[PDB]
Design a protein around this ligand. Structure first.
Ligand SMILES: Nc1ncnc2c1ncn2[C@@H]1O[C@H](COP(=O)(O)OP(=O)(O)OP(=O)(O)O)C[C@H]1O
Ligand SMILES: [Mg+2]
Length: 470
């Protein structure tokens, strides 16, 4: 079977679960969860165009390197996809994650120069922006209105066979880490798709879970919660444990299983083999550092890593409790005492805590507000870390959903967004100032700050929140 343990139940559904699974599908449609068929066709044709451009590009490089006409006639080249799109659970408006795989005679500097220019002169391309210096180098663009983030990797192969499988550990044999990191995404995705008993049932379930997580304010890797990959792996492990169940049951078992999971025991999709290479691998047995991890969900391809080391005490608490409520609602639905709609109802965040901290960030230009909000959000965990060390606080729940904030000037217009943070006690002015000072500081030190880029935080009581809001 699938997994590092035996399944929990091999039971198949009853017609009763089949019609219950159809009502789920129906409850999801209004939420944009399912992309339109005409649009999926649009995206398919778009990738074909891209795949060809990559082919065309590589051939030209194969010619400038004068390689024999035999090689030139067989070098190949290919565009691989990964993440939600490749998983089959991308929603309306979601971006596409792609990797460009080329043979050895095409360097990375070629990707950022020869290939970048080729995209630059295509009629369908817009917003062609590159980031050659990121953790995972990437060229971003908007192809016919579709956001596409493209990684790049150079393999030690002379030619790229159409049936190349990127899971073969040998492919990493002595390669630049940049290349290794760029391959990780596809491998992890391709692994997940090969570790679940029934993909179709996996897709529909993942669909339901991601909506639920987003609606319940716990969807964000950056802010210490879970991102697409993490949710996909949790859902996959659930499938491995109920190989013959369908979506209505899996969604339920998802909550049954994880609301009772004993953290920090790690969530693994397969047994980790040992490989000669010396790459970072999550392993509490050899690495003491990895023992402090709170809610580990490990990547299935070498080198395995914890996809959620941003999860703190607060976030872990929040999600554990959210799993319990989740289990409860599905329990009713399964007893026909509730509708699937009840699972996707968002409990008013602005009313579920007796205290809150509100983050205000703004810049002089819409262009800047967007850039500023970027930097700010990456630092919000710092404040939570502080709020946590405080002896009077139990947890800080940052709502990963920011938004435009009220006017602070009736005259000139304003580009100001805001955040609302949940609090739970067992004054806060000092911790908030350290944060504020630290944000203004790190931003300025890393040359990513402009005069008039403001950031203010303030404590507020529930009753007073509704004021500083719509
Ligand atoms: N920790 C990770 N391990 C392996 N692959 C990762 C990891 N983080 C990101 N990726 C890959 O990069 C992709 C980044 O997009 P991200 O938004 O994080 O997830 P996604 O599920 O593809 O997208 P959605 O949020 O569902 O739209 C997702 C996955 O294919
Ligand atoms: Mg994505």
């Amino acid at each position: 079977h699938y997994g590092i343990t035996s399944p929990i139940s091999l039971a198949a559904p009853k017609e009763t679960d089949c019609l219950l699974t159809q009502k789920l599908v129906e409850t999801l449609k209004p939420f944009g969860v399912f992309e339109e068929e005409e649009e999926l066709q649009r995206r398919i044709l778009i990738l074909g165009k891209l795949n060809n451009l990559v082919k065309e590009w590589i051939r030209e490089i194969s010619e400038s390197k004068n390689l024999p006409q035999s090689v030139i006639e067989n070098v190949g080249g290919k565009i691989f996809t990964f993440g939600s799109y490749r998983l089959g659970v991308h929603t309306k408006g979601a971006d596409i994650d792609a990797l460009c795989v080329a043979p050895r005679h095409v360097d990375r500097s070629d990707f950022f120069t020869s290939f970048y220019d080729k995209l630059k002169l295509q009629e369908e391309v817009k917003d062609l922006r590159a980031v050659e210096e990121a953790f995972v180098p990437v060229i971003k663009l908007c192809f016919d209105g579709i956001e596409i983030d493209i990684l790049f990797a150079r393999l030690a192969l002379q030619t790229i066979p159409e049936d190349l499988d990127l899971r073969d550990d040998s492919l990493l044999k002595n390669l630049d880490i940049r290349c290794i990191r760029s391959l990780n995404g596809c491998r992890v995705t391709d692994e997940i798709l090969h570790l679940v008993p029934n993909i179709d049932n996996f897709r529909l379930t993942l669909r339901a879970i991601k909506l639920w997580a987003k609606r319940h304010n716990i969807y964000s890797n950056i802010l210490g919660f879970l991102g697409g990959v993490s949710w996909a792996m949790l859902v996959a492990r659930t499938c491995q444990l109920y190989p013959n169940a369908i979506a209505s049951t899996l969604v339920h078992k998802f909550f049954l299983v994880f609301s009772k999971w004993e953290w920090p025991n790690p969530v693994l999709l397969k047994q980790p083999e040992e490989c000669n290479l010396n790459l970072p691998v999550w392993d509490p047995r050899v690495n003491p550092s990895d023992r402090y991890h709170l809610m580990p969900i490990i990547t299935p391809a070498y080198p395995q890593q914890n996809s959620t080391y941003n999860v703190s005490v607060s976030t872990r608490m929040v999600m554990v409790e959210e799993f319990k409520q989740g289990l409860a609602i599905t329990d009713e639905i399964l007893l026909s005492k509730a509708e699937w709609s009840k699972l996707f109802e968002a409990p008013n965040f602005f009313q579920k805590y007796k205290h809150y901290i509100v983050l205000l960030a703004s810049a002089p230009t819409e262009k800047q507000r967007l850039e500023w909000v970027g930097l700010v959000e990456s630092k919000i965990r710092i404040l939570v870390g502080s709020l946590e060390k405080n002896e009077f606080i139990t947890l800080a729940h940052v709502n990963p959903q920011s938004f435009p904030a009220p006017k602070e000037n009736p005259d000139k217009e304003e580009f100001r967004t805001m955040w609302v943070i949940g609090l739970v006690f067992k004054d806060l002015t000092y911790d908030i100032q350290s944060f504020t000072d630290t944000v203004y500081r790190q931003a300025i030190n890393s040359k990513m700050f402009e005069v008039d880029m403001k950031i203010a935080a303030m404590h507020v009581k529930r009753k007073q929140l509704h004021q500083l809001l719509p």
